[PDB]
RNA sequence: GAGCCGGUAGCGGGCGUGGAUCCCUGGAUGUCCGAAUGGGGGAACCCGGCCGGCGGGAACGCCGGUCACCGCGCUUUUUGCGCGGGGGGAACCUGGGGAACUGAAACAUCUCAGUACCCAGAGGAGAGGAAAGAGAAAUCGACUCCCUGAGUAGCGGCGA
RNA sequence: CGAAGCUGUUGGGAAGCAGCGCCAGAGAGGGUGAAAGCCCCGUAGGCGAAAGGUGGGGGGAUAGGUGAGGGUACCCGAGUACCCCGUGGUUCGUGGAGCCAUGGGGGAAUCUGGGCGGACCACCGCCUAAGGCUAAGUACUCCGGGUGACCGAUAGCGCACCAGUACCGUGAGGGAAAGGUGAAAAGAACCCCGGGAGGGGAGUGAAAUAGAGCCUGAAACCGUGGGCUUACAAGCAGUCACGGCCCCGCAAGGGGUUGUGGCGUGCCUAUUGAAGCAUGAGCCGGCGACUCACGGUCGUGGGCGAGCUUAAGCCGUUGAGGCGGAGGCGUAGGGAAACCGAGUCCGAACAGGGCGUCUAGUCCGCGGCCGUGGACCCGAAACCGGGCGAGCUAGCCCUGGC
RNA sequence: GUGAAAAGCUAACCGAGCCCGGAGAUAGCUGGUUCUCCCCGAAAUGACUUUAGGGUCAGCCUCAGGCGCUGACUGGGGCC
RNA sequence: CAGGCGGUAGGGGAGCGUUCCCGAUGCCGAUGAAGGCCGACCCGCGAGGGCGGCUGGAGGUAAGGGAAGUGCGAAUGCCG
RNA sequence: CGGUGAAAUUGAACUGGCCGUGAAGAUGCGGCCUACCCGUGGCAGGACGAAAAGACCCCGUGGAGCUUUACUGCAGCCUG
């Protein structure tokens, strides 16, 4: 395969692939594709120890990997980012766009 | 048109063959008290004989099995008529043989049986025959000599 | 593969049109008899009864 | 072969303008569009031979379809289709 | 393009919005073993000539160094460079050496086989190569690979 | 860079469906919580490659190569060819065997000369040896690729798992076994058995007949425990029979087992001749053996059909195609041949005598049936080559010892 | 190769060491077969074989085209 | 309807069971492909084919015919 | 009596005997004779018992060696 995937935080988007409702986004590595962005509710149930909170018995986390999520432009839908040939910044760019320039 | 089951046209049979089973006459060979049967079974090419095959004889026919060369001489071509009295325009070889059919021919000799338009034909040697059925009744040319 | 027919065999027999197994025999190669008295001359050729068959094969490439 | 074939595969309903147009021969729906203005819809199959690049880097995905443009003969596939379409009947092979 | 601390995996602590993560091409590094080549040397463990450099006295060990090699060209007489090159590489080259079993329903010619296989230089090719040719045709016109000729000519205890 | 709808109801969960809206020179393929074009990765395509560097065509191309004839008139690859013997190659094993390198001695000549058209003389022909260099179109593979009616992890690659390891060796050498929880470890919390081990609950958990020799999990081998059998008894044992003896069908019966009675010499390989203590048979699973190439050759649906069939390329083929005549069998035979001819050959022979003529044939797949092939399946002690080889036994060889 | 001797020893086995390959060496040597079913169902002889538990041709079992009353078995009738 | 019918090798007739092909941008398919344990119905003379239940956990390939490393009790076979 | 715990061989069994029969030396076949189930620790008579695929032996136009006034050469000695 090969590294390329999505991106950082900013808002991201959480969706209903078996969850539901959308969120801010957290972190994420591609390698696997695993990551992070709190909602999704899962807890590890620790081992014998006791050093943290205490003994076994996890808590909260997150979950998920491949595609399966959207972005932030509030009213009507969401499209891509287009390109520069004299406009505001040289001929480079893109920071998520609804269809104009913003998000 | 579509696949309507197009089976075949008849007869052909791929009858290929197969293992061991214990089915009808599977599992078997034919022989005995005739052993024969190795890794190089025989081949078999005519092999046997146990007799020389017959093979006492022995060639009287010496005009070959020299060494380098066989015997060499321009083409020897005959022919018949009843093959294309048809077309003529003019008979003369290249336009026959190089076409039709029949191949090369150096020296050209003629013949057959049947019968034809006695016209004049390319004639490296030619048979009395044809003669009569292209003489006072045809026509007939001259070989090479160049 | 290939089969590069056998010479020799051809080097004498021959199958007459009819698909005859024909060809020469053995005997008068000049008396190897003696007896001045008379007899030799008997020769000819001759088919073979069974195995004539078998031969024509060897030679279906050289012909 | 395929003489006889058609033949019955034109009691079928052949045809084949021997050269049609659709539009931009680039743009693969308005193909189509002349695939309806003529009578023809996914269901009952059917091919052609079209000796130009332009329908090909046009008929791009001819699912149920032809889409051809050079010489290989395929009749098979017209087994499991029907109607059809020439490019001159030089094309095809004097 | 904004994630990295090989994977596997943390206790343990660190970097990218001056822009990492990672594939890259030139080239700075890389002990001893490694044809290894100052010398020994059941490699990878081990003693030197000589100049300058370190500690330090000299030393000893630390360093640098530089020093086998033959050959043709070079270089006067032992003088000095130059390269080449030993060494390397799955098939495919060239050459030099070159079997037996097996067939021959025994066996000694013949067979396998100039095969297996050893040794020999080089290239990616290699080998080869331009007529003291072919051959019979008032002819063709370097050499190599395929097309057949032709399994024909022929070789042959004319036996296989 | 790229192309384009969802939706609720149920559903673990929805790639389920209707009502329908959609980009589509681009619906290849890998795929993300159940059989997904409009979804992560792509696929028409056309952007462009460098700094690094970097493999080279085209372009230009640089020093380094490029008139004709006429008579004078000497001059050119030697221990060389050509002899010779032993020769090898050539299809060429001596044979009427030239020419190639010849190992051995001989041993010249240089154009009004010199080699070959396979012996020694005579006519005619193309070439000019004994200097060396020479591309292109040729072979090839660990991998890169692709694909591959390529195998798909007791395969295949020895080998997808840290093997050329464990290991066996002395060298050489030789060689193993060993992939698979799951959408996510989320990998077990906690408390009573407690030697850690190995337990029960609970929880996560769509799923613990889901948890670490865990995928699904059969088979030889295991009894808990159930049901039908049994201590007068003789048997390849199983069968057939009325009968009785526990599940199921209202019924008809369907069952399971067996009493006795009857009935009973198995099984796989060899041969006048078997069941047989003549062999083999651990046991169950699991692997196992004539294609196929090429080549020969009788049939079969066929088409063409005196006529009937083109390799090796070249454009082109996602793919396909293909265009592309040299190569066959016949269209006759027969004859040593010369060569005659529906006819040939022996013979002096018009004659005698054995081989001649509507002989449709011809190439496909399939198949007989063969040729090389090992072509069925493995296997016997050896012969050939090269490597290992006396860290054991040997003999002496050096020197320490007892 | 060695061998105060047999013919012995050479990684315990040595009248010819073993690694590794030249080949499935080879081989008339020995053992192997699993689907259903359905039609004829013969030799254990002759000739010749360094041939004899191998082989050529034959004959009794196979298939197809063709011919077909003529065939196998039978009385008599010549004629051995 | 006469007939035929045991029958080793051999030699015919099919049929059957057994893995890729297109059909496969066609079709079942989680109210299940696939394995299976079971089946004491139906179809197969057989080959088998079914045909439906419970365990079973991710795919399958129609009619058709087109290709075949199989139609394996075993060889003191290979292995586990 | 507690503890740890193989083997080569491995068709399978519900394996008597006599008188007798069948490849001619059976519990397994007759017919006739006995024999309640499982034991232990004893002699092995047979289980042609194991494991060794006869090696004496004949078998292989199968193998290895030595040697002769076999047949053919290498050698190296020889001889112009």
Same mark, same amino acid.
Request: aromatic share 4%.
């Given at each position: 395969?090969?590294?390329?995937?999505?991106?950082?935080?900013?808002?991201?988007?959480?969706?209903?692939?078996?969850?539901?409702?959308?969120?801010?986004?957290?972190?994420?590595?591609?390698?696997?594709?695993?990551?992070?962005?709190?909602?999704?509710?899962?807890?590890?149930?620790?081992?014998?120890?006791?050093?943290?909170?205490?003994?076994?018995?996890?808590?909260?986390?997150?979950?998920?990997?491949?595609?399966?999520?959207?972005?932030?432009?509030?009213?009507?839908?969401?499209?891509?980012?287009?390109?520069?040939?004299?406009?505001?910044?040289?001929?480079?760019?893109?920071?998520?766009?609804?269809?104009?320039?913003?998000? | 048109?579509?696949?309507?089951?197009?089976?075949?046209?008849?007869?052909?049979?791929?009858?290929?063959?197969?293992?061991?089973?214990?089915?009808?006459?599977?599992?078997?060979?034919?022989?005995?008290?005739?052993?024969?049967?190795?890794?190089?079974?025989?081949?078999?090419?005519?092999?046997?004989?146990?007799?020389?095959?017959?093979?006492?004889?022995?060639?009287?026919?010496?005009?070959?099995?020299?060494?380098?060369?066989?015997?060499?001489?321009?083409?020897?071509?005959?022919?018949?008529?009843?093959?294309?009295?048809?077309?003529?325009?003019?008979?003369?070889?290249?336009?026959?043989?190089?076409?039709?059919?029949?191949?090369?021919?150096?020296?050209?000799?003629?013949?057959?049986?049947?019968?034809?338009?006695?016209?004049?034909?390319?004639?490296?040697?030619?048979?009395?025959?044809?003669?009569?059925?292209?003489?006072?009744?045809?026509?007939?040319?001259?070989?090479?000599?160049? | 593969?290939?089969?590069?027919?056998?010479?020799?065999?051809?080097?004498?027999?021959?199958?007459?049109? $009819? +698909? @005859?197994?024909?060809?020469? *025999?053995?005997? #008068?190669?000049? /008396?190897?008899?003696?007896? $001045? +008295? @008379?007899?030799?001359?008997? *020769?000819?050729? #001759?088919?073979? /009864?069974?195995?004539?068959?078998?031969?024509?094969?060897?030679?279906?490439?050289?012909? | 072969?395929?003489?006889?074939?058609?033949?019955?595969?034109?009691?079928?309903?052949?045809?084949?303008?021997?050269?049609?147009?659709?539009?931009?021969?680039?743009?693969?729906?308005?193909?189509?569009?002349?695939?309806?203005?003529?009578?023809?819809?996914?269901?009952?199959?059917?091919?052609?031979?079209?000796?130009?690049?332009?329908?090909?880097?046009?008929?791009?995905?001819?699912?149920?379809?032809?889409?051809?443009?050079?010489?290989?003969?395929?009749?098979?596939?017209?087994?499991?289709?029907?109607?059809?379409?020439?490019?001159?009947?030089?094309?095809?092979?004097?």
């Amino acid at each position: 395969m090969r590294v390329k995937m999505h991106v950082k935080k900013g808002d991201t988007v959480l969706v209903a692939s078996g969850k539901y409702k959308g969120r801010v986004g957290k972190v994420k590595e591609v390698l696997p594709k695993k990551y992070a962005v709190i909602v999704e509710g899962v807890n590890i149930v620790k081992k014998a120890v006791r050093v943290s909170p205490k003994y076994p018995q996890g808590g909260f986390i997150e979950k998920e990997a491949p595609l399966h999520a959207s972005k932030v432009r509030p009213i009507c839908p969401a499209c891509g980012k287009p390109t520069r040939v004299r406009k505001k910044f040289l001929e480079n760019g893109k920071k998520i766009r609804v269809c104009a320039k913003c998000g | 048109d579509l696949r309507p089951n197009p089976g075949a046209n008849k007869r052909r049979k791929r009858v290929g063959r197969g293992p061991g089973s214990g089915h009808g006459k599977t599992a078997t060979r034919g022989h005995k008290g005739q052993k024969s049967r190795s890794g190089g079974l025989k081949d078999p090419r005519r092999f046997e004989g146990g007799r020389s095959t017959t093979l006492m004889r022995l060639p009287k026919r010496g005009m070959q099995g020299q060494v380098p060369g066989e015997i060499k001489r321009p083409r020897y071509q005959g022919v018949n008529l009843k093959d294309l009295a048809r077309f003529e325009g003019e008979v003369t070889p290249e336009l026959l043989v190089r076409a039709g059919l029949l191949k090369k021919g150096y020296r050209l000799k003629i013949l057959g049986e049947g019968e034809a338009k006695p016209l004049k034909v390319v004639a490296h040697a030619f048979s009395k025959s044809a003669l009569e059925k292209l003489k006072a009744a045809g026509g007939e040319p001259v070989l090479l000599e160049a | 593969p290939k089969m590069k027919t056998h010479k020799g065999a051809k080097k004498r027999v021959k199958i007459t049109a $009819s +698909g @005859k197994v024909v060809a020469m *025999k053995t005997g #008068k190669r000049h /008396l190897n008899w003696q007896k $001045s +008295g @008379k007899e030799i001359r008997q *020769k000819g050729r #001759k088919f073979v /009864l069974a195995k004539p068959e078998a031969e024509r094969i060897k030679l279906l490439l050289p012909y | 072969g395929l003489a006889m074939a058609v033949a019955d595969r034109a009691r079928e309903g052949k045809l084949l303008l021997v050269e049609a147009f659709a539009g931009v021969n680039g743009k693969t729906k308005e193909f189509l569009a002349w695939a309806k203005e003529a009578g023809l819809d996914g269901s009952e199959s059917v091919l052609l031979v079209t000796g130009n690049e332009l329908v090909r880097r046009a008929a791009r995905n001819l699912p149920w379809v032809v889409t051809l443009a050079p010489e290989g003969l395929n009749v098979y596939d017209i087994v499991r289709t029907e109607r059809l379409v020439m490019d001159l009947d030089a094309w095809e092979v004097f």
